[PDB]
Amino acid sequence: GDVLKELERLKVEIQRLEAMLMPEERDEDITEEEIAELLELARDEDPENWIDAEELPEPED
């Protein structure tokens, strides 16, 4: 538990490290504007706007 959460913690830090080593970038399609709105959304914590991905449906086929 305590040992594994530390292990998961370490995994996260390592992953965010490599992220850090990635250069910022866009596609024509994406503007600094829209990016601003995106950070804005990303930090929005109002529930009504979100749903857990795990509660998404499972293929009909």
Partner: protein, 88 residues
Amino acid sequence: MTYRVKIHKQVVKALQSLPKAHYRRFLEFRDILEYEPVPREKFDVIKLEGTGDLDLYRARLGDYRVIYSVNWKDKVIKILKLKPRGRA
């Protein structure tokens, strides 16, 4: 379960316009995201806005693109929105 993945309401709605196949791919992207926040190779992902705290990213699922954020502190990945193939 490493990371908790959340989807914005409007994305969930847009998701229903997708072919069974594309939807399946999205779910795999979700499954992978929970272990690996930036699956660079498999989804040609790029860091839009990097800021030590939350980062914005763009993933390519083929016929469309998904933009999401990664909150490293809370370990929360949010699917912000979808975009076309990229009109070029």
